[PDB]
């Protein structure tokens, strides 16, 4: 088996005079809570997924330019200026210079003549760095509730109830079988600052990343929008040669996918399940309204501080948070005594836990996710300790 589901505490709910019970739940991504009533079967409530189905395409950058139909026009020093039809056309890069002219290139007077070279600038197939922006109100927070048996893939779980939430959508009523009609009011909260977030995706090893807004907008590469035929700032990959009598060569600066991947090393990888653009960080704080029932609350005792060992040493989660796993040898179940101090002051708690109630359960438990301030810090799990260095906030590598 192995269930992380945390039993409901007495402090989390209040029973009114008129028989109404207001159960307050903190549901992180993957985090489960067991709610039980006197005589009614145990129900597991959890936040299943945080995602946005196919978000808007902001900017698409060209990594490798597709140059075609290059034309060079030139005239004698006494004759008029050299002109091309591509100069007043879209998706073309043109350069105007002066070429040395004489009798060797058939011109009556020795001097400088007008020369212009134009090339149709486009993008090579499967060589685009597309960007995606999240719409805060469009992100779905799937909350699922099932009884505390295994059922096949095609068949559905008996008693399973699905309730999706957003910033705009907050209240829904569920017919939770034995519990009757329950009012679910789930407050949505993202674990990623969506405002300063862009999903950099390459045409189909990682091919999608969660990059910063400021890093993305300042990429020195030709860009365009979803629907546009031509490329803006196409000269970023076009290099013109020296102007000869009637010839002016055009050079491609080459592929920039390798230059991009080097700067994208260490950048948090984006999670795309088909069309669903998932966010691996975030939570949902719900307030369940129950009627005509007595709630069964189980308050936790503190775990033995001396009986703790590291199952998995504190490491980076991959979304600016710290993850750790602990092994407890004492009596189960209990509440994990977890805190942290910044190197210098050992009396002020600096731990900002993502896990609302870290507990050692009868079956499983022991997973702790937390936020720590930058610099050298010491994480304490009772008597058990570990030094962690949190890296400072960054937008990305230089380009």
């Amino acid at each position: 088996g192995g269930s992380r589901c945390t039993h409901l505490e007495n402090r989390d709910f209040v029973t009114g005079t008129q028989g109404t019970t207001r159960v307050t739940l903190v549901l992180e991504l993957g985090g489960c809570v067991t709610i039980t009533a006197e005589g009614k079967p145990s129900m597991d409530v959890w936040l299943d997924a945080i995602y946005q189905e196919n978000p808007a395409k902001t900017r698409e950058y060209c990594l490798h330019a597709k140059l075609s139909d290059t034309k060079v026009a030139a005239r004698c020093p006494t004759m008029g200026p050299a002109t091309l039809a591509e100069e007043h056309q879209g998706g073309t890069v043109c350069k105007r210079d002066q070429s040395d002219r004489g009798d060797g290139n058939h011109c009556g007077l020795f001097g400088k003549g007008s020369i212009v070279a134009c090339v149709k600038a486009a993008c090579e197939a499967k060589k685009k760095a597309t960007g995606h922006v999240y719409d805060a109100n469009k992100i779905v927070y799937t909350v699922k509730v099932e009884p505390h048996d295994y059922v096949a893939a095609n068949e559905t779980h008996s008693g399973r109830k699905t309730a999706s939430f957003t910033i705009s959508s907050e209240k829904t009523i569920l017919t939770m079988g034995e519990y009757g009609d329950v009012s679910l009011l789930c407050r949505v909260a993202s674990g990623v600052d969506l405002a300063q977030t862009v999903i950099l995706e390459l045409d189909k090893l990682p091919t999608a990343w969660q990059v910063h807004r400021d890093w993305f907008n300042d990429l020195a590469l030709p860009w365009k929008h979803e629907g546009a035929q031509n490329w803006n700032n196409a000269e970023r990959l076009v290099e013109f040669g020296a102007p000869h009598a009637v010839k002016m060569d055009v050079y491609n600066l080459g592929d920039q996918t390798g230059v991009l991947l080097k700067a994208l090393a260490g950048v948090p990888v984006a999670h795309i399940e088909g069309t669903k653009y998932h966010l691996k960080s975030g939570h949902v704080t719900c307030e369940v309204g129950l009627e005509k029932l007595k709630m069964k609350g189980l308050t936790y005792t503190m775990c033995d501080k001396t009986k703790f060992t590291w199952k998995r040493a504190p490491t980076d989660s991959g979304h600016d948070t710290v993850v750790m796993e602990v092994t407890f040898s004492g009596t189960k179940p209990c509440r994990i005594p977890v805190r942290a101090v910044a190197h210098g002051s050992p009396d002020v708690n600096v731990a900002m836990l993502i896990t609302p109630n870290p507990t050692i359960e009868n079956n499983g438990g022991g997973f702790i996710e937390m936020q720590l301030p930058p610099g050298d810090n010491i994480i304490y799990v009772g008597e058990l300790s570990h030094q962690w260095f949190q890296k400072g906030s960054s937008i990305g590598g230089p380009f």
Binding site: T70, K71, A73, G104, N105, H244, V246, K247
Partner: protein
């Protein structure tokens, strides 16, 4: 190298890497190709003028020149 009359009054020569340092006959005159940055025909192609130089005039700073034939251009793909 293929000699053809375009939509304009210009005569266009479509040459390849094999046509480097060779001479092609265009109408009543002759055209000489000296371009070294040539290759197989594709979308990425460069097009320019083949200067019609007078009687006994030596070519200066040019890789394509023609005699007795006016309004002549050269095009070649760079996929080789």
């Amino acid at each position: 190298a293929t000699v053809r009359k375009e939509r304009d009054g210009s005569t266009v020569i479509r040459a390849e890497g094999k046509d480097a340092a060779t001479q092609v006959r265009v109408e009543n005159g002759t055209c000489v190709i000296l371009a070294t940055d040539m290759g197989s025909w594709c979308d990425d192609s460069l097009s320019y003028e083949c200067v019609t130089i007078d009687q006994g005039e030596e070519p200066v700073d040019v890789d394509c020149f023609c005699r007795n034939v006016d309004g002549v251009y050269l095009e070649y793909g760079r996929c080789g």
